[PDB]
Amino acid sequence: KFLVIAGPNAIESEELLLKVGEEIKRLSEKFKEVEFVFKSSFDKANRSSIHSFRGHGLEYGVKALRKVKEEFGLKITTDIHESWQAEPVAEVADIIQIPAFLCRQTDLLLAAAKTGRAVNVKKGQFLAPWDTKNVVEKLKFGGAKEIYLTERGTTFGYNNLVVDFRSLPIMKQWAKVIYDATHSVQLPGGMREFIFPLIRAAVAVGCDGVFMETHPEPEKALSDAPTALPLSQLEGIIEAILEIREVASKYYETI
Amino acid sequence: EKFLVIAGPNAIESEELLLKVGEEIKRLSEKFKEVEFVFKSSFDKANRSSIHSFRGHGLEYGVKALRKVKEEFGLKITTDIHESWQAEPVAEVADIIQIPAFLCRQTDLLLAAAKTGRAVNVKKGQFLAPWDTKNVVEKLKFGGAKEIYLTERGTTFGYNNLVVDFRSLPIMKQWAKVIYDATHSVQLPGGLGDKSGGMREFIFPLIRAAVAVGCDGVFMETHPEPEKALSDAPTALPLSQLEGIIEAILEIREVASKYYETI
Amino acid sequence: KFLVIAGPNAIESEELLLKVGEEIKRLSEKFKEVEFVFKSSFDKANRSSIHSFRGHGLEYGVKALRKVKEEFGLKITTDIHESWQAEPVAEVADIIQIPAFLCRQTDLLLAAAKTGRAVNVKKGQFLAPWDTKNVVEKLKFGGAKEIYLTERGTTFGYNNLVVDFRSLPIMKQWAKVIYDATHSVQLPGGMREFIFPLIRAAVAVGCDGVFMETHPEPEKALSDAPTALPLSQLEGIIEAILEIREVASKYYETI
Amino acid sequence: EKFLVIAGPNAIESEELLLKVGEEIKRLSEKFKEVEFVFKSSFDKANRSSIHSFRGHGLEYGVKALRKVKEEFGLKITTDIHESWQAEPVAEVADIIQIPAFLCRQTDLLLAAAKTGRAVNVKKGQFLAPWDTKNVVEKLKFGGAKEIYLTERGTTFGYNNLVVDFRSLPIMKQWAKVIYDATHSVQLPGGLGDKSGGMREFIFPLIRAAVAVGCDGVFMETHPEPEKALSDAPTALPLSQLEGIIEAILEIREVASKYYETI
């Protein structure tokens, strides 16, 4: 079934994760035809500034995420940044996320594959759609069974990303495709007004899921604030994508 | 508001080709009564890559052939001009005057189209940012245009490739009705050397995206036998596939419409 | 010999043209190994705003340019925008300039070629280097003998142009290559600090000439003000490009 | 200030290859005494497109082979790290620690390199704007780096293509010494499918442009027989051509130097 990955960008506190986890659990009950996956980063390892929020560490992170998986029975997903983090993270994360800048780091992908968990690779902003074929092959080589590719925009001049929707059907040839509705409209080094419109485009085109970051108070997010979707808007957007998908799916091309 | 479907052969290869496509468009206009159809065909391909490629049979012949289509089928007409002097004679048959993408900044061409009293449709240049169309519309309004359209047809993305930045649809809607060009947005500029390339397998999904995002119309070239087209062959849509494509966009538009953001 | 095209962007007045013409005449006398060509537009036919300066018309324009060619004996070049302007302009213009946005308009190129004059086509910001081969062929077909291709930047995301110096050697395969040092750093819809550095790059790479706009008081230019090179800086830059060329020319690749 | 020339085989295919290239670099360092040479070679290609491409013989072997080059020829050494833990052992031989382009934003890798006391050279990511390197340098300074380099190696320009925006040289010079990567800037990312492509015919002219604009050094990969390289073959420069290229950049640099803008 259709996949919806959502949660706060960073693990600002397990308190925050439980508040978002509650709303995602609720939505999960209201939309049984959808498989929800809770997402949150235990570390922002690639901030532009040394003076920005990174997180509370992997320890506190896996701890807080475990609390969500136990308290709400929601699947879990978080990103890793170096090979050694694959094993400890695999303890709670149902899906291991590979950062976009790291989509080509062979050992990170192999370490993720080895854990036996599912792997979701964010397509680098420098990568062409067809070049993801090799990414998938590395994961298969590493023993990966559940592989996802996430579209999150492509470099378009400076401090700007454009979403080439031709990548959805192209990447679908070798993996399940997820659309990152949040970071695809962010401006490197974002504009919330384009999140919903492009989400609609992604489902009209055809994808296996949507990646969507949410926060009680977006403007207060310690990371990616100008892109955080308000918690209260999640339901409406999900209902919207399901309806569009239902009608459009009739025309999705055969693999 | 009535959705707009602009369609037709890329070039006026012959009056016969036009009448053949016109008949089908007419048939579709009878079925899809909630759609406003506009028959399109260029009397001249004035910007081919090669001096050896097909251009057309002249403005006179073209206007004559177009008039025949309007008389025989009662369809609105649209064609593009390349120099100011063509605006007047073209306005005698064209309901919508189209401005080529490379020429979207040529002040006199725009002014010439605007003073005819006809509607004007400007193809957004591959070099233009979405927010830069605000001045294009201002020029037209200044020149007297009352019905203005802006057509999205892709943006330069590296060499011989175009990308469609769907953020442009809601941006351009701030000052004009927006049209999505389903065939040229997947075209590969001069990708074939003396001719341009194209990827027909992406035409349909990108069109679905366009209507899901929200636009006021779609523009699509069609031809009985695409591979025989004298121009844009790699992008021409098989005439028999037009009905299904249209039904699909109307369905996707209906279900997505309640979510279209207010400008 | 090496070509230097210079002058004010627009014909703000024949007075302005005579003041710049005097300095270019002087430079022409000081650098005999260089062929100078006076440039100025009788109309800015593609301004973004309807409320901006266009010019005084073709009449007043050809008039003022004729005054420069007679008073200083300097060759002339100006751009045309529609086919009918080729003939009247060919009366004074030694080189007919084709605007970048119009580099693919067949009739404009043919009308220019027919006049017998030399033709300089500005490479469209949407065009690939190799795609200029066809541009040249149209001109040859039209009877052109002296054909130039000018590099003026390529679309790089929004409101930004990047100069791909690989285009110089590629275009040199079928025509003489001129480098537009002024508009190559302008931001569509500019930064003067990059004009000189990239001019140096162009000659180090290898080109047949440089296109350079100048004005007594750049900030007062009615068009392209943020890019107009100060008249007083022309000499130093020319001397600089000649010295770099002299040393680098030893390594220019064979066609 | 002494111009920097960083050169060597792309990968440590074998200690033999290294000693063969090292001998030549050593010979050149004796001739071009006004140049500071740094021998380069990766102990591991950790970001190949295909899982089937050559990677190397391990960090231990690589560091061993590099140390041999430094001992036998007295040449400075530089190699790149891929994870934080590699910084320490690599710092035992490397005079300059290189940070891969895709990893230019990985805070811990940068911090790991900085605390070794060694010089740090960051390849500017193909996704990074020139002005965005200001924070990269700040991170390094924060982590204790006293000698920092920023290397220009091209920017994403459409798919499978890189363009060099020379405006970046004077921009990055505002906060660090700038190095121009003559071989990877003309590389075609994954242009060959399971491998990347490249256009060797542009290496030389772009290098001339780099020195004419103004930089503090050039980085160039070389190999006795480029077409036999186990990686970056389409871009490796023939070892015998190194001397002439270097002489040329020194000549162009000298004549252009009086015009370099002051930062």
Ligand SMILES: O=C(O)[C@@](O)(C[C@@H](O)[C@@H](O)[C@H](O)[C@H](O)COP(=O)(O)O)OP(=O)(O)O
């Ligand atoms: O899902 C994610 O967490 C993330 O989008 C990573 C993203 O959160 C960060 O890259 C974030 O955009 C970045 O750290 C912001 O940097 P600034 O310091 O605000 O410029 O995955 P990616 O690898 O696609 O970037």
Ligand SMILES: O=C(O)[C@@](O)(C[C@@H](O)[C@@H](O)[C@H](O)[C@H](O)COP(=O)(O)O)OP(=O)(O)O
């Ligand atoms: O040499 C030229 O005159 C010109 O560079 C034309 C150039 O002067 C104009 O295009 C100018 O940049 C433009 O009119 C400025 O538009 P604004 O209205 O300031 O946005 O030739 P091109 O065809 O390469 O643009």
Ligand SMILES: O=P(O)(O)OC[C@@H](O)[C@@H](O)[C@H](O)CO
């Ligand atoms: O096939 P070439 O000659 O490149 O020209 C194609 C164009 O005519 C086509 O994209 C469209 O009709 C106008 O640009």
Ligand SMILES: O=P(O)(O)OC[C@@H](O)[C@@H](O)[C@H](O)CO
């Ligand atoms: O040839 P593939 O496998 O695409 O990788 C090439 C890269 O290793 C090369 O550009 C460089 O060594 C690092 O990116």
